[PDB]
Ligand binder design. Structure first.
Ligand SMILES: OC[C@H]1O[C@@](CO)(O[C@H]2O[C@H](CO)[C@@H](O)[C@H](O)[C@H]2O)[C@@H](O)[C@@H]1O
Ligand SMILES: OC[C@H]1O[C@@](CO)(O[C@H]2O[C@H](CO)[C@@H](O)[C@H](O)[C@H]2O)[C@@H](O)[C@@H]1O
Ligand SMILES: OC[C@H]1O[C@@](CO)(O[C@H]2O[C@H](CO)[C@@H](O)[C@H](O)[C@H]2O)[C@@H](O)[C@@H]1O
Length: 468
């Protein structure tokens, strides 16, 4: 028997709902699907739908009912979705689809993407105060998984992540950023899975590696939760006690790996934490050297940005923690993966579905202690045919690094699909995510984006639901 939702979480949840219940209702974002075997016919269906939506009958029908009817057609090879809040946006977006023109709320392709999507599990720097709260209050499936992770983390570390999510006065530190983003990562993917989606492959980045192992079938949710919990409290306790000459900084620099090779001969104590993009690398080390390399970068007109931490993960500074990390993970059970893994721990190499288990106790030690080969994992996915990268996160920070690598690999038509984003309506965001999965032909039951009909008013008087 796991712990239940704490009383303080229930208390905070009630305050949040009363807050929510007294706000201005925003019009929901509705996906309108249209498709055909031929792009020409798809374009004609779009203009026909927009003609009718302009008619008095179409004006009197709700977007939700129009979208539900559309959701029930046959879904052809050439597809499009218009995301819309009202009839104008819809008609406007439909006119672009008909015209073959681009629009911010419009996705349209002549045919499906050929290979499945890669789920990107990062997190590093994606966090913000209220992340995940709105979707917890408003999506029952999301909320169920958050509470499930919240119960396991209560059991591992003795506190409630849900309390952090719901209490606006509270913010995130080295430790709680990791367990909370993890919880958000788990809940976003299960939400997606609930609507019929699934990863073709996963790739992770530091904190995200735990969730990637779960979505890859490499660890039970419990053992993935043990993996993120042990690493995160050790890191937060470790860097908390760092002062003076024990301080190691972390910074992003616009230097490639080959540049870093040359540049580090002047700085004997610097190490690579993350190969993020082909020309962006996260480095760590003593403050004097970190400051010097940044100064070298600025003078060379390159980007350099210091992070907020007195300790450097993925460096030798993690050596004191590894003994305890080992003890806390005794008992985990690695399992043969059920989708592909681009392992940025193991230098970015690919592990086939059904291969040998990788998510060993040694794997989590190596992951915390050593460099993250992110751009190599991504480059490897591109070179093996993947074009869709979907990032589960409260903010799509890693998708920026992914775009750098895909363009560098020559792939300019990449499907870069975010999930949540700060100051974007969290429900609208997920609508948009699942819309995009559909338009590109990935696994997604577009019918599940609409509540079951309880009346004829739930459909619009169009095919396939015309009224006799
Ligand atoms: O939720 C808004 C409103 O609720 C109050 C109590 O009436 O505070 C609740 O919500 C805060 C935000 O999450 C919590 O920090 C607080 O603990 C909780 O009681 C008001 O103070 C606030 O304006
Ligand atoms: O250890 C000496 C060696 O390392 C340098 C590199 O810049 O400095 C570092 O080591 C010092 C300890 O001896 C620290 O005080 C300092 O913070 C660190 O950058 C040079 O002093 C020399 O080449
Ligand atoms: O073409 C089939 C393919 O399309 C997806 C979405 O990309 O599912 C759609 O088509 C199904 C009928 O074949 C519908 O059941 C579903 O509602 C619709 O989204 C994929 O999931 C499917 O493999």
């Amino acid at each position: 028997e796991l712990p239940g939702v704490t009383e303080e979480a229930l208390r905070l949840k009630e305050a949040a709902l009363e807050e929510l219940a007294a706000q201005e209702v925003t019009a929901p974002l509705v996906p309108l699907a249209v498709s055909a075997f031929l792009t020409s016919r798809k374009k004609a269906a779009a203009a026909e739908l927009a003609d009718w939506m302009q008619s008095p009958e179409g004006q009197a029908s709700s977007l939700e009912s129009i979208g539900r009817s559309l959701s029930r057609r046959n879904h052809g090879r050439s597809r499009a979705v218009v995301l819309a809040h009202d009839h104008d946006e819809a008609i406007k977006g439909l006119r672009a689809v008909a015209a073959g023109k681009q629009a911010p709320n419009v996705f349209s392709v002549d045919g499906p993407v050929t290979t499945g999507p890669v789920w990107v599990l990062a997190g590093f720097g994606a966090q913000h105060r209220k992340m995940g709260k709105s979707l917890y209050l408003r999506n029952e499936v999301f909320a169920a998984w958050i509470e499930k992770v919240d119960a396991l983390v209560q059991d591992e570390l003795g506190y409630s992540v849900l309390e952090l999510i719901l209490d606006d006065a509270q913010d995130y530190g080295i430790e709680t950023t990791q367990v909370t983003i993890f919880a958000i990562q788990i809940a976003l993917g299960e939400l997606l899975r609930h609507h019929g989606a699934k990863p073709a492959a996963v790739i992770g980045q530091s904190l995200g590696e735990a969730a990637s192992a779960y979505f890859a079938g490499g660890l039970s949710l419990r053992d993935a939760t043990r993996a993120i919990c042990s690493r995160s409290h050790l890191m937060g306790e470790g860097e908390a006690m760092l002062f003076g000459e024990y301080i190691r900084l972390m910074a992003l620099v616009e230097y490639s790996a080959d540049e870093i090779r040359e540049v580090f001969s002047d700085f004997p104590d610097l190490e690579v934490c993350v190969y993020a993009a082909p020309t962006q690398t996260v480095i760590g080390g003593p403050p004097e050297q970190v400051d010097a390399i940044l100064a070298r970068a600025e003078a060379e007109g390159k980007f350099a940005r210091k992070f907020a931490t007195k300790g450097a993960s993925h460096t030798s500074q993690m050596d004191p923690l590894l003994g305890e990390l080992t003890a806390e993970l005794q008992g985990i059970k690695p399992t043969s993966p059920t989708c592909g893994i681009f392992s940025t721990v193991h230098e970015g190499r690919y592990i086939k579905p059904g291969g040998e288990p990788i998510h060993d106790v040694e794997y989590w030690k190596k992951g915390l202690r050593h460099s993250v080969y992110f751009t190599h994992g991504i480059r490897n996915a591109v070179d093996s045919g993947h074009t869709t990268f979907l990032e589960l996160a409260p903010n799509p920070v890693a998708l920026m690094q992914v775009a750098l690598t895909t363009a560098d690999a020559g792939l300019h038509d990449a499907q870069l699909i975010p999930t949540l984003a700060r100051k974007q309506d969290e429900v609208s965001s997920m609508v948009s995510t699942m819309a995009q999965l559909y338009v590109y032909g990935h696994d997604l039951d577009i019918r599940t984006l609409f509540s079951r009909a309880s009346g004829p008013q739930d459909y619009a008087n169009i095919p396939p639901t015309r009224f006799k």
